[PDB]
Amino acid sequence: CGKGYHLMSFPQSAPHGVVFLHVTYVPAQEKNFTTAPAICHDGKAHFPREGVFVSNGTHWFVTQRNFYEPQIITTDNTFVSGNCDVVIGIVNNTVYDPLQPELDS
Amino acid sequence: DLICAQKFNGLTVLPPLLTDEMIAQYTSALLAGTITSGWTFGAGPALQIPFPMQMAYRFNGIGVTQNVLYENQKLIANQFNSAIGKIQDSLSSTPS
Amino acid sequence: STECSNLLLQYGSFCTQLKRALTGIAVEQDKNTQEVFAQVKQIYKTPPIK
Amino acid sequence: MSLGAENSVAYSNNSIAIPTNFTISVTTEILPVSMTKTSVDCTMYICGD
Ligand SMILES: *[C@@H]1O[C@H](CO)[C@@H](O[C@@H]2O[C@H](CO)[C@@H](O)[C@H](O)[C@H]2NC(C)=O)[C@H](O)[C@H]1NC(C)=O
Ligand SMILES: *[C@@H]1O[C@H](CO)[C@@H](O[C@@H]2O[C@H](CO)[C@@H](O)[C@H](O)[C@H]2NC(C)=O)[C@H](O)[C@H]1NC(C)=O
Numbered sequence: 595c596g597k598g599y600h601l602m603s604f605p606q607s608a609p610h611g612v613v614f615l616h617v618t619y620v621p622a623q624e625k626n627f628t629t630a631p632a633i634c635h636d637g638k639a640h641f642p643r644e645g646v647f648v649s650n651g652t653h654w655f656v657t658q659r660n661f662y663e664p665q666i667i668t669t670d671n672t673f674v675s676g677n678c679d680v681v682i683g684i685v686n687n688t689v690y691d692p693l694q695p696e697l698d699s
Numbered sequence: 700d701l702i703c704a705q706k707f708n709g710l711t712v713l714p715p716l717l718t719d720e721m722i723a724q725y726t727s728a729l730l731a732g733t734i735t736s737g738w739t740f741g742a743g744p745a746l747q748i749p750f751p752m753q754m755a756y757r758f759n760g761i762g763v764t765q766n767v768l769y770e771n772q773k774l775i776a777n778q779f780n781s782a783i784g785k786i787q788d789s790l791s792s793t794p795s
Numbered sequence: 796s797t798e799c800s801n802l803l804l805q806y807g808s809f810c811t812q813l814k815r816a817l818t819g820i821a822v823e824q825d826k827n828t829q830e831v832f833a834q835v836k837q838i839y840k841t842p843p844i845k
Numbered sequence: 846m847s848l849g850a851e852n853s854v855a856y857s858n859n860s861i862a863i864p865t866n867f868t869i870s871v872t873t874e875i876l877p878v879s880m881t882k883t884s885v886d887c888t889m890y891i892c893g894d
C-alpha cells in the first residue's frame with residue numbers, strides 16, 4: 595500500500611479502474627547514535643521493553659525505534675534477564691529506579 | 700544447431716534488457732540493504748543497525764523476547780551458518 | 796518467395812497482430828524483471844570488514 | 846544504463862541511525878478494473894444480410 599510505512603489509503607474512481615492514494619509515513623532526518631544491546635547494572639542485564647538503547651556520546655538513553663525520543667533508562671522501560679556475562683557488547687550504565695526517591699523522602 | 704535452424708526461418712531471440720551482471724548487482728544491493736540496514740531501506744532511508752540488534756528486532760517480530768537472541772547469539776549464528784552451507788550442498792546435489 | 800508474400804497480403808493484418816502480440820510479451824518480460832529486482836533506487840554496498 | 850545512485854551504508858558493530866523527523870507521503874497507484882463489454886453478432890459479422 596505504497597512506499598513507506600503505510601498509514602491509510604483513499605480510493606478514487608477512474609474510467610475502467612481505481613486510483614489509490616496511499617498515505618504512508620517516511621522517516622527522515624536520521625542521526626547517528628552509539629548503540630548497545632543491553633545495559634549492565636548491579637550485575638544484571640537490562641534490555642529495552644519496546645525501544646533501543648542509544649548514546650549521544652556521553653549519556654545513555656532508551657528511545658523508540660522509529661522516531662528519536664530519548665528517555666532516561668529506568669526499570670519501567672527495561673526488563674532484567676540474566677547477568678552481564680553472556681551478552682556480547684553489553685555496556686555499563688546506571689538504571690534509575692522510580693521508587694528510590696519515593697521511599698527516601 | 701537448434702539455434703541456427705530457428706534463426707534461419709525468421710525466429711529471433713531478443714536479448715534481455717537487464718544483463719545477468721546487472722541483476723546480480725541488484726541482488727547484491729538488496730542483500731547489502733537487508734544486512735546493514737534491516738527493513739529500514741525498503742521503507743525510506745537506509746538506517747544502519749548492528750546485525751545482532753536487527754536479529755533481535757526480528758525475534759521480537761515473531762513473539763520471542765530479544766534476550767533469547769542475545770543470550771544464544773553464538774548458537775543462532777552457528778545454526779544459520781550451518782543451514783546456509785546445507786543449502787549450497789542441497790542445491791548442488793539435487794537435479795530436480 | 797515474392798509470390799507467397801503477394802498471396803499472404805490478401806489475409807490482412809494477421810502478421811501485424813502476431814508481431815504486436817510478441818512485442819507485448821517481449822516488453823512484458825523486461826517489465827517483470829524490473830518489478831522483481833529493481834525495487835531499490837540506491838545501490839547499497841557492504842562494509843569492507845564483513 | 847545506471848542501475849542507481851551508489852550508496853555505502855556506514856555499518857559498524859555499535860552504531861545505529863534513528864530518524865528524528867518524518868514525511869507524510871501520498872502516492873498514487875492506478876489499477877485497471879474492467880474492460881469494454883463487447884458483443885458480436887456472429888452471423889451478421891461473417892455474412893451480413
Ligand atoms: C547528551 O544528552 C544529555 C542530555 O540531554 C546532555 O546533558 C545535558 O547537556 C546540556 C548541554 O550540554 C546541559 O545544559 C545539561 O545540564 C546536561 N544534562 C545532564 C543531566 O548532564 C549531554 O550534554 C549530551 N551530550 C552530547 C555530547 O551532546
Ligand atoms: C562494568 O562493570 C563491572 C563491574 O563494576 C566491571 O567488572 C570489573 O572489572 C574490574 C576491572 O576490569 C575487575 O577487577 C573486577 O573483578 C570486575 N568485576 C566483575 C564482577 O566482573 C567491568 O569491567 C565493567 N566494564 C566496563 C567496560 O567498564
Ligand SMILES: *[C@@H]1O[C@H](CO)[C@@H](O[C@@H]2O[C@H](CO)[C@@H](O)[C@H](O)[C@H]2NC(C)=O)[C@H](O)[C@H]1NC(C)=O
Binds near residue numbers: 625853855856862
Ligand atoms: C554516521 O557516521 C558515518 C561515519 O561517521 C557517516 O558516514 C560517512 O558519510 C560521509 C558522507 O556521505 C562519507 O563521505 C563517509 O565516507 C562516511 N563514512 C563511512 C565510514 O561510511 C554517516 O553519514 C553518518 N550518518 C548520518 C546520518 O550523518
Ligand SMILES: *[C@@H]1O[C@H](CO)[C@@H](O[C@@H]2O[C@H](CO)[C@@H](O)[C@H](O)[C@H]2NC(C)=O)[C@H](O)[C@H]1NC(C)=O
Binds near residue numbers: 865866867
Ligand atoms: C521536521 O521537518 C519539518 C518539515 O518536514 C520541519 O518543518 C519546517 O520547519 C522549518 C523551520 O522551522 C520551516 O521553515 C518550514 O516551513 C517547516 N515546514 C513545514 C512543512 O512545516 C520541522 O521543523 C522538522 N522538525 C525537526 C524537529 O527537525
Ligand SMILES: *[C@@H]1O[C@H](CO)[C@@H](O)[C@H](O)[C@H]1NC(C)=O
Binds near residue numbers: 856
Ligand atoms: C567490530 O567491527 C570492526 C569493523 O567493523 C571489526 O574489525 C571488529 O572485529 C568488530 N569487533 C569484533 C569483536 O569482532
